[model samples]
Target: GEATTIWGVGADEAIDKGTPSKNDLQNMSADLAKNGFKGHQGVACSTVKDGNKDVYMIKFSLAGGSNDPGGSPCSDD
Candidate 1:
């Protein structure tokens, strides 16, 4: 299996259960790479309910890295 590590989460203003555009993901990957987190594979957008509003939490992942302590609670794999 691929070593998918949770990079970080980003909140989306619009409420949708769909994934973000490729351009958006590419931009995010570039930003992460610039910050030293190389080997950008892709991202996952999970729809989380915060009170009454829905928050789209974007989780970024890298290629080869061990999962650090105190990671996101939404990862089941």
Candidate 2:
């Protein structure tokens, strides 16, 4: 399954899903705006060559704190 990485401004903050689609990004930005986040902070993508499969590693940052509600993870366990 695809994975996501979540981070906050703090160094110890981190979490996990996949690269967000255009619609996903749009919704995220809109939600951020609705809650008063200025704009997108950063985005990056790279291919991961893991054994037999290669997946993309995606990272995104919206203006907010660690406590802010974020996207769902690829896996909960």
Candidate 3:
């Protein structure tokens, strides 16, 4: 998985599984658009649960996604 992936999904699962979460992808895509539209095509993957499935070591996961609704607009955009 790459750092770009919030859930650490490595590649497109258009064959194996499918895509990542819809909400996550939408947020990322929007971020890409607002952030100069760098052509970020959001990613999707899965995760594991040791106990709490709602937690993540990935500091910049959901909340880190920029240009999201209800979130502060991009300072540059």
Which of the numbered candidates is closest to the native, going by highest TM-score? Answer: 1
lDDT of candidate 3 over 41-62, digit per residue (tens): 4432233223333222211223
lDDT of 2 at 53: 47
Better of 2 and 3 by TM-score: 2
Q: Which stretches of candidate 1 lie over 4 Å from their true place?
A: 1-15, 36-54, 58-77
Task: Put down candidate 2 lDDT per residue, 2-76, tens digits, no spaces.
Answer: 223334322211322445568766865576445543433442222332333444333334433444434532211
**Model 2 bad stretches (over 4 Å):** 1-17, 37-77
Residue 67, candidate 1: alpha-carbon lDDT: 65
Clashing pairs in 2: 3-17, 4-17
TM-score of 3: 0.26
- Per-residue lDDT value at 44 in model 1: 45
Cα deviation of 9, candidate 2, in Å: 2.3
Tens digit of per-residue lDDT, candidate 1, span 1-77: 57656565555555656665788778656765675455546544344444456655545555456564234524212
Model 2: how far is 72 from its true place, Å?
Answer: 21
Ranking by lDDT: 1, 2, 3
TM-score of each: 0.32, 0.27, 0.26
Better lDDT candidate (1, 2): 1
Q: Where does candidate 2 have its weakest 10-residue lDDT segment?
A: 8-17
